[PDB]
Structures are given as C-alpha cells and as structure tokens.
Design a binder for this molecule. Structure first.
Ligand SMILES: Cn1cc(CC(=O)O)c2ccccc21
Ligand SMILES: [Cl-]
Ligand code: NA
Length: 445
C-alpha cells in the first residue's frame, strides 16, 4: 500500500502517496517533513489550490509558506514552498539545491503543464540534490468507478419516449422530482431541454456562460447540463442521467495535409463518471442512469497533450524540443503515472523544424491564453510571410486581423487546429517538413 507518507531516505528515491483530497497529503505531510528540518516543495496544477494551501498552513499551523504562481510569488523564507507546476517550470525547474523533498500533488493530472512539470522534477531532482520525490494523488492511474453505497445504478434500455445517445429515457422517470441530465454539448442541452419542455416537463439548460439562478432552488425540474455545472452549482438531485461521453482535445493524423488537433467526442473515463454520478445521493439515496457501462479507467491521455508540452516548452519556458523530450522521457519511464503513446521523437522532430517564429505573434497568442500558442503563432507567422489569410477568422487567428485587407489567396496550411474556411495550398516547405516527420516515424506512419 502507498497510503502512508514515505520516510525521508538517505539518498534519492521516488515514492507514491495515494491519499484522499484534504487528508493531509498536501499540508500535514509537508508540515511534518519541515518539522524534521527538510525543505519541501509542493507542486499543484491549480493556482486556487496553491493559494489555499497557504491559507490553511498559516491559520492551522502558524506556518507561513512561500507561495508561487504565475501572477506573483510570496516569499517568507520558510522551509515549505507551494508552487503551481507552471510557475515551477517558468522558474527554471529544480534550480537546486533548493529543496530536499518535492511533492508532486495531483500527479494523475493530464494537463500539459502538470506532465511537463512532473517530468522536469523527475529528470532534475536527484542532480539538484533532493532526497525524495513524492508522486501524490487521490486518483491513481488505472482507477475505475467503484460502487457507491448510497447510489442505485440503473442502465438505460431502448424502452422510452425520449431518445438519448442510442438509448431511451422513459418520461415517467423524470416527471416529478429534480433530475440532472449530462449532455456532451451545449447544443444537445438546448435540444433536449426544448424537447422536454414541449413534452410538458419543467426543464432548463445549463452550460458555460449562463447564470446559476436559471436553475430553480425548489420545485420539480429537469436540468440539462454540461460539465460546466460542476463548477458551477452546488445542489444535488433525485437522479443523474449520464450520456457517458465527453468532449476532449485529440490529435488525428488525418494527412490533410498533416495532423488535426481539435475537440472530439470520446468515451468518458472513471473520473468523469464518478464526478457526474456524485451529483445525486447526497443526504438521501440517489439514482444514476447510464447509456453504457463504463469506462476508460483514469490515467490515459492523448498524444495531443505531448504536442502541447513541446508547444509550451517553446512558448513559455525557453526549452528546445530536445530539452522537452528529456523531461517527458523521464515521465514516461516512471511507473505509476498517467500513460500515453510514445510520440516523443515525432513531436520533437516537428517542433525542431518550426524555426523563426514571429516574436510579436507569439506574445500575442500567449497573452491571449488560447491553446497551442506556439503552433497558432507559427501558422500565423507563415501566413503573414506569404501574405496569405489564416485557415479561418476564428478568434484564434486574431493577430492577423490588422493585416486582413492585404492577406489573399490560399492558406499555406501547416496542420489543422479548428475548422477550415479558406482555400488551402500544401506547397509550403514547412508543410512538407511536417509530412516527412510523420513518414519518418514508425509509430505515426
Ligand atoms: C502556462 N502556465 C501556467 C502557469 C500556472 C500559473 O499560473 O501559476 C504558468 C506560470 C508561469 C508561466 C506559465 C504558466
Ligand atoms: Cl491536504
Ligand atoms: Na418551464
């Protein structure tokens, strides 16, 4: 069992800590390490969680930790430091020998910043003079949704008036009471909520960019929502009905001309299933209805996230693709972490050829906070240098707006990051370069 905090070893060691959120793993455990005289770094994917550790440690233990985020760093000179993974990377990683112990919290996290952060720690900690790296999570990879004592789970059949993701919902099952239906998209939420209204039911849609008050506090209601609800709203429900699908970023080696990165419908994993289910069964018995028995277990992520790491290396952290590969290699080689196809050589080769980006476009896409700032600005750079329009006039291609009256002809398409709305040419040298990266890799070709 990995349920107890590791003892500090005499020389270097990587260990796992599996413990629930709030249980002490991010707070009590580093406090106890510091009471022993060690300097402790705690990394977390969230700015909010990171600040919150500081508030807990101060008020509960009279410990004022250092707190480091992209906005600002607060330094007390104390032995414990909380940082986001992003700020840690921006600070140069293990500029040791600063810390004796590094706790990678929520180490199941599969956002690109966490992955690159954790790989950085694993590649650098020992050389930086650390004695211990703790990979801590409340949700170890390979986790599956487990039975809940207060929630009755009932599969959907094909019997029912309301068509729902290949199955049916009987109306009797949502007439009277308060029910929550998860749909994968805002459009499905609008379609279903309209349909239910027409059937005489009290239904209302909820998603990103609507007020929480549009959900009534009392009364029979059927709420039709996306995962936006969970951040979100607080009340619980008589039942949850889950479409068991979600929208996520995926790469497709679509060869038109190269690859496509976009949001795609995919099977839901154990974490999503557990979270959606958990909106019923609070304080009384709940009901969970599902389209499909799950799941993907947790802890698998898409090759597009590896791409995103190389992107971030080049955009934010002044890392060459070769440097990024070293860090990601340490991550992939460490057992017990999230897993993904080994596309390191491929993605490295691609970014290696993306030379002479325009600095001003890159600062614009960075400041704008859109995904893949490096690839978006590189496409924009290619567009401007060819006096050609962007793939579309989506907000993505914002930096080219001032130049719009002088951009014309087909887009020299490098790859696809969203919908295509202009004529394309595939003659650009970089396009050819990226196609060759694909052909030169047996895992991708
Ligand atoms: C991409 N990215 C995320 C973070 C996390 C944070 O906001 O602390 C970050 C920090 C500094 C530089 C870049 C960063
Ligand atoms: Cl904790
Ligand atoms: Na109504």
């Amino acid at each position: 069992d990995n349920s107890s905090p590791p003892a500090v070893p005499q020389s270097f060691q990587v260990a796992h800590l599996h413990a629930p959120t709030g249980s002490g793993k991010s707070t009590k455990v580093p406090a106890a390490y510091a009471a022993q005289g060690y300097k402790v770094l705690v990394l977390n994917p969230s700015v909010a969680a990171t600040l919150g550790f500081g508030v807990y440690m101060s008020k509960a233990h009279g410990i004022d930790p250092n707190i480091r985020t992209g906005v600002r760093a607060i330094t007390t000179g104390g032995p414990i430091t909380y940082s986001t993974y992003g700020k840690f990377l921006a600070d140069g990683g293990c500029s040791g020998g600063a810390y004796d112990i590094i706790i990678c919290d929520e180490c199941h996290s599969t956002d690109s910043t966490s992955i690159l952060g954790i790989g950085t720690v694993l590649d650098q900690a020992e050389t930086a003079g650390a004695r211990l790296v703790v990979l801590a999570t409340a949700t170890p990879p390979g986790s599956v949704t487990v039975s809940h004592p207060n929630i009755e789970e009932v599969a959907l059949s094909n019997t029912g008036e309301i068509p729902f993701y290949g199955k049916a919902i009987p109306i009797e099952v949502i007439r009277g009471g308060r029910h929550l239906i998860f749909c994968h998209s805002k459009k499905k939420c609008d379609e279903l909520a309209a349909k239910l209204s027409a059937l005489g039911l009290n239904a209302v849609a909820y998603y990103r960019g609507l007020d929480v008050s549009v959900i009534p506090t009392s009364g029979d209601v059927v709420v039709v929502a996306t995962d936006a609800l969970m951040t979100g709203y607080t009340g619980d429900f008589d039942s949850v009905i889950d479409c068991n699908t979600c929208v996520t970023q995926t790469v497709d080696f679509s060869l038109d001309p190269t690859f496509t990165i976009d949001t795609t419908t995919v099977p839901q994993d154990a974490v999503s299933r557990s979270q959606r289910r958990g909106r019923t069964g609070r304080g009384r018995r709940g009901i969970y209805r599902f389209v499909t028995p799950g799941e993907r277990p947790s802890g698998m992520f898409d090759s597009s996230v590896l791409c995103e790491c190389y992107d971030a290396g080049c955009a934010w952290y002044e890392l060459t693709p070769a440097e990024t590969s070293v860090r990601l290699r340490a991550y992939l080689n460490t057992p017990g972490l999230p897993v993904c196809q080994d596309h390191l050589e491929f993605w490295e080769s691609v970014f290696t050829g993306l030379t002479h980006i325009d600095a001003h476009f890159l600062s614009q896409t960075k400041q704008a906070g859109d995904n893949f700032p490096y690839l978006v600005a590189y496409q924009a750079t290619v567009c401007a240098r060819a006096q050609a329009p962007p793939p579309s006039w989506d907000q993505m291609w914002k930096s080219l707006t001032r130049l719009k009256p002088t951009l014309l002809g087909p887009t020299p398409l490098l790859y696809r990051l969203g919908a295509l709305q202009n004529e394309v040419t595939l003659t650009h040298p970089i396009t050819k370069y990226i196609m060759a990266c694909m052909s030169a890799d047996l895992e991708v070709v």
